């Protein structure tokens, strides 16, 4: 390019920047093509180019000018880019905001969808605010290849589309655009289907949606509604290991953390709206905004010391008591709790606070409500037709297609979609093994074996490893986990290797062992010693994430304490022990809201939680309990940089099985941040018990979990202890301990304590 042309970019003299900015055409070679894409970087002073699915990136070079820059790139196809921008000692990558120039779709962007490849395929199809014929208005489109018709119907129409019919392109996609409406616009899509049967469909990529049980969508201008300010979180993220660093997770299920008043407005950012009722049953109570939540729940998760917080899903459901995995609007967080804003608001309020956002997501079924995407066009459009692989009969619902191709897009998109729109650090995938399995939940000759004559769904595994290779790329940093309960191997392990690309998965063995150790009576639990140990025998098979989730504490299983045995005090002495071992235990952590504070009843979707609890001495206490916990977890390199190696974990001794004791180690790079356990899984104290430790020196008590501030009867070790020289568990050194009743003790060598 001419320094003409680029001071005319500069002095904001150019006709139209899109001829110049974005990615242009160069040549076209016998195998590839030669591209280049150009930016103005006003306070930049470097780019580069992403290609991440192409795995590579090339500097950009400032030509003219010092904040114009342009990079040539040769390949047979330049779809998917980024743009990495530093301005001083900061980077940021973003998509490339010239890199369309049209609202309407493209040849380009219908053959990618058409082969399931349109990574951005959401700008396009839905509904987006822009100008056609130098109009402003909407464009719509979507997908619908065996309808016979489509119309807009709508507030702007009196719901009456006859003068809004779309046009069909391509055989596969229809199109309208409508001048002068614009975001806040309600539609729906009417749909004639090849039998002459009309009906009403929510969009399936629309953005925002009225309250359930209305399923009307909504036009959002996504991309102007919200400025972020999470940029030094985003780079931080992008350039971490998150394996290597604390991750504890408060799980929330956001209608039933806590309700507001009905008798009032629900207020957002910078509005306010309607309550919404949270049941006819329980009708003085609204859910909390998006934004009430930003104010009050993420104060409350900063003070706990949690790292992240992971939400039941939030794409758009229509009934409460699917907990949100029955969904229908998978292109927008529910409107139950307002507005696209105020999320990405709850979201930049967390990255401000230094927590990051986990998205429970949903891309294993779908309901057969007809608002959604059931037989969409007249046929068995996003599920397969044959209900042996296309609906799991047991729940009532229809399992997407993964092996057609603009269904595969539908969903690859949306996993990005939300990283991209609303900047979450992770998502993860419930029941994973529905997906996996051509034969789930299906008996003997209600369902068919794949080409080879096995079991494993092929199109869902790749479809899975998909998903996991494009996030990790475009995302870098992120959490991917999954819920898998049959043993399929290599979960967290990366695609290359054979593995599904998940980069966490949920211990449901070590789950199930846990809660069944601490269910027996303690004199019992001599008998059960292996619960304690065995999740060690296969615990590098994957990288584990240890979980207490929401499933647990429902339908009749109880609440945390109401799982132990013995009197108030040993309930929660048990609770203590337990989670004090969890978060010393190899892998990362996730615990549910109300277990923090001993709520005693079952979690209940309908109601809130029971807050009331916390005006009382024992749940406060269980509660600053965690937050010492939390805090200690962070501050300890050895609870987080090494769950993944054997360098990270070693046994002391597991052999007193007839006093329910254990004890290990943890380890991190430098061997001065070497951590000492010891577990006492009954009510019996023991005076002068020997553990083997490495070193000499004083060993410091740093946490205690029968200290009298968490509710326990304050024995212990005085502060710490100072090593005998007198081998014990094939150790050279010992120490001689009081254990106190049902704890744990983590001590840690003070290398420069004076003797
Ligand atoms: O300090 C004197 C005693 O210290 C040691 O006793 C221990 C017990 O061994 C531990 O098990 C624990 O005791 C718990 C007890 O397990 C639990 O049931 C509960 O017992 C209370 C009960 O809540 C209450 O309603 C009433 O019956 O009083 C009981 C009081 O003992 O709470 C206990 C803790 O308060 O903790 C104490 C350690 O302090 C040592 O073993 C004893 O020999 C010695 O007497
Ligand atoms: O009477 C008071 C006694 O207190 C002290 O004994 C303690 C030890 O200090 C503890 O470490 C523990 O002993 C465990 C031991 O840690 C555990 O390994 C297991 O030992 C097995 C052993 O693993 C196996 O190799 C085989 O050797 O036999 C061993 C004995 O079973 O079980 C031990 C407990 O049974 O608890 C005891 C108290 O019970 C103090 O050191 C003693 O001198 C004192 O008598
Ligand atoms: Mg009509
Ligand atoms: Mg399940
Ligand atoms: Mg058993
Ligand atoms: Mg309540």
Not at 82 to 89: C, I, P, R, S, T
Not at 635 to 643: G, I, K
Not at 679 to 694: A, D, K, L, M, W
């Amino acid at each position: 390019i001419s320094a003409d042309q680029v001071n005319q970019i500069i002095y904001n003299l150019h006709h139209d920047p899109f001829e110049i900015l974005g990615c242009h055409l160069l040549e076209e070679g016998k195998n590839t093509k030669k591209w280049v894409v150009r930016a103005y970087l006003p306070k930049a002073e470097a780019a580069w180019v992403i290609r991440p699915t192409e795995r590579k990136e090339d500097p950009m070079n400032s030509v003219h000018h010092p904040n114009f820059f342009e990079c040539i790139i040769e390949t047979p196809e330049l779809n998917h880019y980024q743009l990495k921008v530093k301005e001083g000692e900061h980077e940021k990558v973003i998509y490339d905001p010239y890199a369309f120039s049209s609202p309407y779709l493209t040849d380009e962007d219908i053959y990618l969808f058409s082969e399931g490849n349109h990574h951005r395929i959401y700008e396009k199809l839905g509904a987006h605010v822009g100008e056609i014929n130098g109009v402003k208005g909407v464009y719509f489109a979507v997908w619908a290849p065996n309808a016979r018709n489509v119309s807009v119907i709508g507030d702007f129409n009196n719901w009456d589309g006859r003068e809004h019919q779309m046009r069909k392109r391509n055989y596969t996609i229809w199109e309208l655009f409508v001048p002068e409406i614009g975001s806040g616009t309600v539609y729906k899509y009417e749909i004639k289907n090849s039998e002459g049967h009309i009906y009403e469909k929510s969009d399936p990529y629309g953005f925002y949606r009225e309250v359930r049980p209305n399923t009307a969508s909504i036009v959002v201008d996504i991309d102007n509604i919200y400025q972020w300010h999470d940029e030094e979180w985003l780079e931080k993220r992008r350039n971490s290991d998150p394996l290597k660093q604390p991750v504890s997770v408060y799980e929330v299920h956001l209608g039933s953390w806590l309700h507001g008043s009905s008798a009032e407005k629900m207020p957002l950012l910078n509005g306010e709206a309607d309550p919404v009722i949270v049941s006819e049953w329980n009708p003085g109570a609204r859910f909390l905004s998006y934004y009430e939540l930003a104010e009050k729940l993420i104060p409350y998760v900063k003070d706990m010391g949690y790292t992240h917080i992971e939400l039941l899903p939030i794409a758009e459901h229509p009934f409460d008591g699917s907990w949100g995995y029955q969904v229908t609007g998978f292109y927008s967080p529910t409107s139950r709790f307002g507005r696209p804003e105020d999320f990405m608001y709850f979201v930049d309020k967390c990255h401000e606070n230094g927590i990051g956002v986990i998205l429970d997501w949903v891309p294993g079924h779908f309901p057969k409500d007809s608002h959604g995407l059931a037989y969409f066009d007249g046929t068995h459009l996003y599920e397969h037709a044959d209900p042996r692989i296309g609906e799991h009969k047991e729940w009532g619902t229809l399992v997407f297609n993964y092996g057609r191709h603009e269904v595969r897009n539908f969903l690859v998109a949306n996993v990005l979609f939300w990283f991209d729109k609303y900047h979450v650090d992770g998502i993860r995938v419930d029941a994973v093994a529905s997906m996996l399995y051509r034969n789930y939940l299906r008996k003997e000759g209600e369902w068919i074996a794949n080409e080879y004559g096995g079991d494993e769904h092929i199109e869902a595994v790749s479809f899975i490893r998909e998903v996991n290779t494009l996030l990790f790329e475009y995302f870098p940093g992120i959490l991917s986990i999954a819920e898998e309960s049959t043993e399929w191997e290599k979960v967290s392990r990366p695609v290359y290797d054979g593995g599904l690309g998940f980069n966490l998965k949920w211990d449901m063995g070590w789950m199930h062992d846990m809660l069944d150790y601490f269910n027996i009576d303690p004199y019992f639990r001599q008998y059960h010693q292996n619960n304690v140990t065995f999740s060690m025998a296969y615990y590098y098979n994957e990288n584990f994430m240890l979980a207490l989730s929401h499933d647990e504490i429902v339908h009749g299983k109880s609440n945390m304490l109401g799982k132990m045995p013995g009197d108030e005090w040993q309930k929660y002495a048990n609770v203590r022990a337990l989670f004090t071992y969890m978060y010393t235990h190899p892998g990362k952590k996730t615990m549910f809201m109300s277990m923090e504070f001993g709520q005693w009843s079952e979690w209940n979707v309908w109601g809130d939680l029971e807050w009331h609890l916390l005006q009382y001495e024992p749940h406060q206490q269980l509660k600053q309990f965690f937050t010492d916990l939390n805090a200690l977890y962070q501050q300890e390199p050895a609870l987080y940089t090494h769950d993944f190696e054997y360098h990270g974990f070693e046994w002391i001794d597991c052999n007193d099985n007839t006093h329910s004791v254990v004890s290990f180690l943890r380890r991190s790079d430098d061997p001065n941040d070497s951590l000492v356990v010891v577990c006492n899984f009954t009510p019996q104290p023991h005076s002068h018990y020997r553990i083997g430790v490495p070193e000499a020196g004083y060993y410091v008590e740093l946490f205690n979990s029968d200290a009298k501030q968490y509710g326990g009867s304050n024995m212990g070790n005085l502060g710490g202890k100072w090593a005998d020289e007198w081998s014990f568990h094939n150790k050279p050194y010992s120490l001689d301990l009081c254990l106190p009743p049902l704890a744990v003790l983590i001590l840690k060598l003070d290398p420069t304590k004076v003797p």
